[PDB]
């Protein structure tokens, strides 16, 4: 980590690192894998509160 | 912004955006350092003295 990154860059780096270890979604030849890998690590901003 | 590719086949390896001019962690076991005097052109403005 460096002193000029963005929070979204932090999320992308963490997602790549987690997917590197092998904990990611199965390659089922389907978009399910893409969506699941998209929704691993997330950040909640002001407009997306549930 | 740094992009690295192989010199014989051309397969993509990595791309990075750094601010301390230190490409590290994309080539394992090696840290690469590039001086900040690459790709800079300098001009003088006498109208605004800058």
Q: What is the dihedral of CA B12, B17, B19, B30, to 10 degrees?
A: -30
Strands B12-16 vs B2-5: parallel, antiparallel or unpaired: antiparallel
Helix, strand, coil % (nearest 5) of chain B? 0, 30, 70
Determination technique for this entry: cryo-EM
Q: Enumerate the residues of chain B whose CB falls inside 8 A of the CB of residue A4.
A: 19
Backbone angles phi, psi at B15, to 5 degrees: -140, 140
Identify the closest residue of chain A to B24 by CA–CA distance.
Answer: A1
How far apart CA A44 and CA A50 sit, in angstroms, is 9
Strands B2-5 vs B31-33: parallel, antiparallel or unpaired: unpaired
Is residue B14 within 8 A of residue B25, CB to CB? The reply is: no
- Find which of A1, A2, A5, A17 to mutate to test the B interface (most B CBs within 10 Å of its CB): A2
Identify the closest residue of chain B to A13 by CA–CA distance.
Answer: B16
Check chain A for breaks (C–N over 2.5 Å) and list the residue before each, or none. Answer: none
DSSP one-letter code for A47: G
B22 pairs with which residues across the strands? B33
The Cβ-side half-sphere exposure at A2, using a 13 Å CA radius, reads 14
């Amino acid at each position: 980590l460096e002193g000029d990154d963005t929070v979204s860059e932090f999320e992308t780096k963490l997602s790549s690192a987690i997917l590197e270890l092998g904990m990611g979604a199965t390659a089922g030849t389907s978009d399910e894998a893409a969506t699941v890998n998209s929704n691993l690590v997330n950040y909640v901003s002001t407009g997306d509160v549930t | 912004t740094i992009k690295v590719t192989d010199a014989h086949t051309g397969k993509f390896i990595g791309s990075d955006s750094v601010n301390d001019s230190t490409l590290r962690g994309v080539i394992q076991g090696v840290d690469v350092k590039i001086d900040s005097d690459v790709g800079v052109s300098i001009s003088w403005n006498s109208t605004k003295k800058t």
